[PDB]
JSON list of C-alpha atoms and ligand atoms in Angstrom, two decimals:
[
{"chain": "A", "resi": 1, "resn": "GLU", "atom": "CA", "xyz": [9.76, -29.01, 6.07]},
{"chain": "A", "resi": 2, "resn": "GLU", "atom": "CA", "xyz": [13.10, -27.63, 7.08]},
{"chain": "A", "resi": 3, "resn": "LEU", "atom": "CA", "xyz": [12.55, -24.46, 4.91]},
{"chain": "A", "resi": 4, "resn": "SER", "atom": "CA", "xyz": [9.35, -23.46, 6.77]},
{"chain": "A", "resi": 5, "resn": "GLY", "atom": "CA", "xyz": [9.68, -19.96, 8.13]},
{"chain": "A", "resi": 6, "resn": "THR", "atom": "CA", "xyz": [12.24, -18.55, 5.84]},
{"chain": "A", "resi": 7, "resn": "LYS", "atom": "CA", "xyz": [11.73, -14.85, 4.83]},
{"chain": "A", "resi": 8, "resn": "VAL", "atom": "CA", "xyz": [12.21, -14.22, 1.06]},
{"chain": "A", "resi": 9, "resn": "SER", "atom": "CA", "xyz": [11.29, -11.96, -1.89]},
{"chain": "A", "resi": 10, "resn": "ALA", "atom": "CA", "xyz": [8.65, -13.63, -4.07]},
{"chain": "A", "resi": 11, "resn": "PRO", "atom": "CA", "xyz": [7.19, -12.53, -7.50]},
{"chain": "A", "resi": 12, "resn": "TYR", "atom": "CA", "xyz": [3.63, -10.97, -7.14]},
{"chain": "A", "resi": 13, "resn": "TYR", "atom": "CA", "xyz": [1.50, -10.58, -10.30]},
{"chain": "A", "resi": 14, "resn": "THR", "atom": "CA", "xyz": [2.44, -6.25, -13.68]},
{"chain": "A", "resi": 15, "resn": "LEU", "atom": "CA", "xyz": [5.52, -7.87, -11.95]},
{"chain": "A", "resi": 16, "resn": "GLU", "atom": "CA", "xyz": [6.73, -6.77, -8.36]},
{"chain": "A", "resi": 17, "resn": "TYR", "atom": "CA", "xyz": [8.82, -8.45, -5.91]},
{"chain": "A", "resi": 18, "resn": "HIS", "atom": "CA", "xyz": [7.33, -8.57, -2.35]},
{"chain": "A", "resi": 19, "resn": "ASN", "atom": "CA", "xyz": [8.51, -9.92, 0.92]},
{"chain": "A", "resi": 20, "resn": "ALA", "atom": "CA", "xyz": [7.17, -13.34, 1.79]},
{"chain": "A", "resi": 21, "resn": "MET", "atom": "CA", "xyz": [7.58, -16.30, 4.18]},
{"chain": "A", "resi": 22, "resn": "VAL", "atom": "CA", "xyz": [8.07, -19.97, 3.08]},
{"chain": "A", "resi": 23, "resn": "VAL", "atom": "CA", "xyz": [5.25, -22.13, 4.26]},
{"chain": "A", "resi": 24, "resn": "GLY", "atom": "CA", "xyz": [6.47, -25.42, 2.74]},
{"chain": "A", "resi": 25, "resn": "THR", "atom": "CA", "xyz": [7.88, -27.25, -0.39]},
{"chain": "A", "resi": 26, "resn": "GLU", "atom": "CA", "xyz": [5.44, -27.75, -3.32]},
{"chain": "A", "resi": 27, "resn": "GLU", "atom": "CA", "xyz": [6.04, -28.35, -7.20]},
{"chain": "A", "resi": 28, "resn": "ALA", "atom": "CA", "xyz": [5.10, -25.43, -9.41]},
{"chain": "A", "resi": 29, "resn": "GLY", "atom": "CA", "xyz": [6.16, -27.68, -13.22]},
{"chain": "A", "resi": 30, "resn": "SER", "atom": "CA", "xyz": [9.60, -27.19, -11.38]},
{"chain": "A", "resi": 31, "resn": "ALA", "atom": "CA", "xyz": [10.33, -27.65, -7.68]},
{"chain": "A", "resi": 32, "resn": "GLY", "atom": "CA", "xyz": [8.96, -24.77, -5.77]},
{"chain": "A", "resi": 33, "resn": "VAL", "atom": "CA", "xyz": [7.76, -23.29, -2.29]},
{"chain": "A", "resi": 34, "resn": "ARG", "atom": "CA", "xyz": [4.45, -22.14, -1.14]},
{"chain": "A", "resi": 35, "resn": "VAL", "atom": "CA", "xyz": [4.96, -18.63, 0.12]},
{"chain": "A", "resi": 36, "resn": "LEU", "atom": "CA", "xyz": [2.76, -16.26, 2.22]},
{"chain": "A", "resi": 37, "resn": "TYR", "atom": "CA", "xyz": [3.12, -12.31, 1.55]},
{"chain": "A", "resi": 38, "resn": "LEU", "atom": "CA", "xyz": [4.42, -10.47, 4.69]},
{"chain": "A", "resi": 39, "resn": "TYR", "atom": "CA", "xyz": [2.61, -7.03, 4.23]},
{"chain": "A", "resi": 40, "resn": "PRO", "atom": "CA", "xyz": [-1.20, -7.54, 3.51]},
{"chain": "A", "resi": 41, "resn": "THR", "atom": "CA", "xyz": [-2.96, -4.46, 2.11]},
{"chain": "A", "resi": 42, "resn": "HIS", "atom": "CA", "xyz": [-6.24, -6.09, 1.56]},
{"chain": "A", "resi": 43, "resn": "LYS", "atom": "CA", "xyz": [-8.20, -8.65, 3.82]},
{"chain": "A", "resi": 44, "resn": "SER", "atom": "CA", "xyz": [-7.78, -11.37, 0.96]},
{"chain": "A", "resi": 45, "resn": "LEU", "atom": "CA", "xyz": [-4.09, -11.24, 1.42]},
{"chain": "A", "resi": 46, "resn": "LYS", "atom": "CA", "xyz": [-4.08, -11.90, 5.28]},
{"chain": "A", "resi": 47, "resn": "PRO", "atom": "CA", "xyz": [-2.74, -15.35, 6.11]},
{"chain": "A", "resi": 48, "resn": "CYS", "atom": "CA", "xyz": [-5.36, -18.05, 6.70]},
{"chain": "A", "resi": 49, "resn": "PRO", "atom": "CA", "xyz": [-5.13, -19.08, 10.38]},
{"chain": "A", "resi": 50, "resn": "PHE", "atom": "CA", "xyz": [-6.93, -22.35, 9.53]},
{"chain": "A", "resi": 51, "resn": "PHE", "atom": "CA", "xyz": [-5.02, -23.33, 6.51]},
{"chain": "A", "resi": 52, "resn": "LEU", "atom": "CA", "xyz": [-1.64, -23.14, 8.40]},
{"chain": "A", "resi": 53, "resn": "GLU", "atom": "CA", "xyz": [-3.23, -25.68, 10.73]},
{"chain": "A", "resi": 54, "resn": "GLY", "atom": "CA", "xyz": [-4.47, -27.92, 7.90]},
{"chain": "A", "resi": 55, "resn": "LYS", "atom": "CA", "xyz": [-8.19, -27.16, 9.17]},
{"chain": "A", "resi": 56, "resn": "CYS", "atom": "CA", "xyz": [-9.48, -24.84, 6.22]},
{"chain": "A", "resi": 57, "resn": "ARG", "atom": "CA", "xyz": [-12.66, -25.93, 4.46]},
{"chain": "A", "resi": 58, "resn": "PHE", "atom": "CA", "xyz": [-11.35, -24.14, 1.18]},
{"chain": "A", "resi": 59, "resn": "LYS", "atom": "CA", "xyz": [-8.74, -24.99, -1.42]},
{"chain": "A", "resi": 60, "resn": "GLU", "atom": "CA", "xyz": [-9.32, -22.03, -3.67]},
{"chain": "A", "resi": 61, "resn": "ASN", "atom": "CA", "xyz": [-12.21, -19.66, -2.52]},
{"chain": "A", "resi": 62, "resn": "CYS", "atom": "CA", "xyz": [-11.21, -18.85, 1.10]},
{"chain": "A", "resi": 63, "resn": "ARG", "atom": "CA", "xyz": [-11.66, -15.30, 2.49]},
{"chain": "A", "resi": 64, "resn": "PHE", "atom": "CA", "xyz": [-8.03, -15.24, 3.36]},
{"chain": "A", "resi": 65, "resn": "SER", "atom": "CA", "xyz": [-4.84, -16.29, 1.52]},
{"chain": "A", "resi": 66, "resn": "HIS", "atom": "CA", "xyz": [-3.39, -19.63, 1.14]},
{"chain": "A", "resi": 67, "resn": "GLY", "atom": "CA", "xyz": [-0.40, -18.20, -0.40]},
{"chain": "A", "resi": 68, "resn": "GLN", "atom": "CA", "xyz": [1.09, -18.75, -3.81]},
{"chain": "A", "resi": 69, "resn": "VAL", "atom": "CA", "xyz": [3.38, -21.40, -5.15]},
{"chain": "A", "resi": 70, "resn": "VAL", "atom": "CA", "xyz": [6.51, -20.05, -6.88]},
{"chain": "A", "resi": 71, "resn": "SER", "atom": "CA", "xyz": [9.48, -21.89, -8.33]},
{"chain": "A", "resi": 72, "resn": "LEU", "atom": "CA", "xyz": [12.81, -21.92, -6.30]},
{"chain": "A", "resi": 73, "resn": "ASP", "atom": "CA", "xyz": [14.37, -20.16, -9.35]},
{"chain": "A", "resi": 74, "resn": "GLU", "atom": "CA", "xyz": [11.96, -17.13, -9.06]},
{"chain": "A", "resi": 75, "resn": "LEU", "atom": "CA", "xyz": [12.96, -16.60, -5.53]},
{"chain": "A", "resi": 76, "resn": "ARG", "atom": "CA", "xyz": [15.17, -13.65, -4.40]},
{"chain": "A", "resi": 77, "resn": "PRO", "atom": "CA", "xyz": [16.67, -12.62, -0.96]},
{"chain": "A", "resi": 78, "resn": "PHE", "atom": "CA", "xyz": [14.40, -10.90, 1.56]},
{"chain": "A", "resi": 79, "resn": "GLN", "atom": "CA", "xyz": [14.57, -7.10, 0.94]},
{"chain": "A", "resi": 80, "resn": "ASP", "atom": "CA", "xyz": [14.74, -5.45, 4.35]},
{"chain": "A", "resi": 81, "resn": "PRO", "atom": "CA", "xyz": [12.90, -2.25, 4.33]},
{"chain": "A", "resi": 82, "resn": "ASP", "atom": "CA", "xyz": [14.62, 1.03, 4.20]},
{"chain": "A", "resi": 83, "resn": "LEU", "atom": "CA", "xyz": [13.19, 3.75, 6.45]},
{"chain": "A", "resi": 84, "resn": "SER", "atom": "CA", "xyz": [16.06, 6.45, 5.83]},
{"chain": "A", "resi": 85, "resn": "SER", "atom": "CA", "xyz": [13.92, 8.48, 3.36]},
{"chain": "A", "resi": 86, "resn": "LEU", "atom": "CA", "xyz": [10.83, 8.46, 5.68]},
{"chain": "A", "resi": 87, "resn": "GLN", "atom": "CA", "xyz": [10.29, 11.94, 7.19]},
{"chain": "A", "resi": 88, "resn": "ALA", "atom": "CA", "xyz": [7.32, 14.32, 8.02]},
{"chain": "A", "resi": 89, "resn": "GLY", "atom": "CA", "xyz": [5.02, 14.58, 4.84]},
{"chain": "A", "resi": 90, "resn": "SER", "atom": "CA", "xyz": [6.30, 11.31, 3.42]},
{"chain": "A", "resi": 91, "resn": "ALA", "atom": "CA", "xyz": [3.74, 8.93, 2.04]},
{"chain": "A", "resi": 92, "resn": "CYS", "atom": "CA", "xyz": [3.92, 5.41, 3.64]},
{"chain": "A", "resi": 93, "resn": "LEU", "atom": "CA", "xyz": [2.23, 2.08, 4.33]},
{"chain": "A", "resi": 94, "resn": "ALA", "atom": "CA", "xyz": [1.36, 1.92, 8.22]},
{"chain": "A", "resi": 95, "resn": "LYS", "atom": "CA", "xyz": [0.18, -1.19, 10.09]},
{"chain": "A", "resi": 96, "resn": "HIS", "atom": "CA", "xyz": [-3.26, -0.78, 11.64]},
{"chain": "A", "resi": 97, "resn": "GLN", "atom": "CA", "xyz": [-4.95, -2.95, 14.56]},
{"chain": "A", "resi": 98, "resn": "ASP", "atom": "CA", "xyz": [-7.00, -4.71, 11.90]},
{"chain": "A", "resi": 99, "resn": "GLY", "atom": "CA", "xyz": [-3.68, -6.34, 10.72]},
{"chain": "A", "resi": 100, "resn": "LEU", "atom": "CA", "xyz": [-3.41, -4.67, 7.29]},
{"chain": "A", "resi": 101, "resn": "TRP", "atom": "CA", "xyz": [-1.07, -2.02, 5.94]},
{"chain": "A", "resi": 102, "resn": "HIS", "atom": "CA", "xyz": [-2.97, 1.11, 4.98]},
{"chain": "A", "resi": 103, "resn": "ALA", "atom": "CA", "xyz": [-1.88, 4.02, 2.85]},
{"chain": "A", "resi": 104, "resn": "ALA", "atom": "CA", "xyz": [-0.96, 6.81, 5.48]},
{"chain": "A", "resi": 105, "resn": "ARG", "atom": "CA", "xyz": [1.27, 9.96, 5.80]},
{"chain": "A", "resi": 106, "resn": "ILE", "atom": "CA", "xyz": [3.86, 10.68, 8.43]},
{"chain": "A", "resi": 107, "resn": "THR", "atom": "CA", "xyz": [3.02, 13.73, 10.42]},
{"chain": "A", "resi": 108, "resn": "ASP", "atom": "CA", "xyz": [6.10, 13.51, 13.06]},
{"chain": "A", "resi": 109, "resn": "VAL", "atom": "CA", "xyz": [9.26, 11.40, 13.60]},
{"chain": "A", "resi": 110, "resn": "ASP", "atom": "CA", "xyz": [10.58, 11.15, 17.10]},
{"chain": "A", "resi": 111, "resn": "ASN", "atom": "CA", "xyz": [13.51, 8.67, 17.86]},
{"chain": "A", "resi": 112, "resn": "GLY", "atom": "CA", "xyz": [12.10, 5.87, 15.97]},
{"chain": "A", "resi": 113, "resn": "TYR", "atom": "CA", "xyz": [8.43, 6.73, 16.49]},
{"chain": "A", "resi": 114, "resn": "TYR", "atom": "CA", "xyz": [6.23, 7.73, 13.64]},
{"chain": "A", "resi": 115, "resn": "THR", "atom": "CA", "xyz": [3.05, 9.42, 14.00]},
{"chain": "A", "resi": 116, "resn": "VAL", "atom": "CA", "xyz": [0.79, 8.58, 10.89]},
{"chain": "A", "resi": 117, "resn": "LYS", "atom": "CA", "xyz": [-2.34, 9.97, 9.56]},
{"chain": "A", "resi": 118, "resn": "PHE", "atom": "CA", "xyz": [-4.20, 7.39, 7.60]},
{"chain": "A", "resi": 119, "resn": "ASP", "atom": "CA", "xyz": [-5.67, 8.34, 4.19]},
{"chain": "A", "resi": 120, "resn": "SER", "atom": "CA", "xyz": [-8.89, 6.38, 5.08]},
{"chain": "A", "resi": 121, "resn": "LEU", "atom": "CA", "xyz": [-11.33, 8.66, 6.96]},
{"chain": "A", "resi": 122, "resn": "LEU", "atom": "CA", "xyz": [-12.59, 5.66, 8.85]},
{"chain": "A", "resi": 123, "resn": "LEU", "atom": "CA", "xyz": [-9.09, 5.07, 10.52]},
{"chain": "A", "resi": 124, "resn": "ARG", "atom": "CA", "xyz": [-7.79, 7.15, 13.36]},
{"chain": "A", "resi": 125, "resn": "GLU", "atom": "CA", "xyz": [-4.14, 8.92, 13.69]},
{"chain": "A", "resi": 126, "resn": "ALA", "atom": "CA", "xyz": [-1.75, 6.37, 15.11]},
{"chain": "A", "resi": 127, "resn": "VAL", "atom": "CA", "xyz": [1.87, 5.99, 16.49]},
{"chain": "A", "resi": 128, "resn": "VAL", "atom": "CA", "xyz": [3.97, 3.15, 14.94]},
{"chain": "A", "resi": 129, "resn": "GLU", "atom": "CA", "xyz": [7.53, 2.06, 15.40]},
{"chain": "A", "resi": 130, "resn": "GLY", "atom": "CA", "xyz": [10.04, 0.78, 12.53]},
{"chain": "A", "resi": 131, "resn": "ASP", "atom": "CA", "xyz": [8.24, -2.62, 12.54]},
{"chain": "A", "resi": 132, "resn": "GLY", "atom": "CA", "xyz": [4.89, -1.00, 11.60]},
{"chain": "A", "resi": 133, "resn": "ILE", "atom": "CA", "xyz": [5.97, 1.30, 8.89]},
{"chain": "A", "resi": 134, "resn": "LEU", "atom": "CA", "xyz": [6.98, 0.83, 5.28]},
{"chain": "A", "resi": 135, "resn": "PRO", "atom": "CA", "xyz": [8.35, 3.12, 2.58]},
{"chain": "A", "resi": 136, "resn": "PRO", "atom": "CA", "xyz": [5.78, 3.28, -0.45]},
{"chain": "B", "resi": 1, "resn": "LIG", "atom": "ZN1", "xyz": [-8.48, -20.66, 4.31]}
]
């Protein structure tokens, strides 16, 4: 699989396009790709570590994501995140140590370092760089 590792924009079911990564080629009934969504917001969207190695017990009911098969025609280019609008008080999605993107709020911005206050009471304040923050 030569296409494996390609960053793209894939349709996620309302219709919304989200950044994804091509895992491999697979028929949809047209020629398609199996993709994994880049920014998981729930545990079920986290990529399955065992599936990517061909060692998962599950085919449909795994705790983690095995991705979605989309037709080549439905794919769009990878949409690079725009952090220009993101300032103090802006709502955002910030990456936590648990590996998920949680709803947060920027409390400060200092030369590409964003201090975020997570909406969830169970999560501490944190400092993230541009690779750990997304516009809402
Ligand atoms: Zn799995």
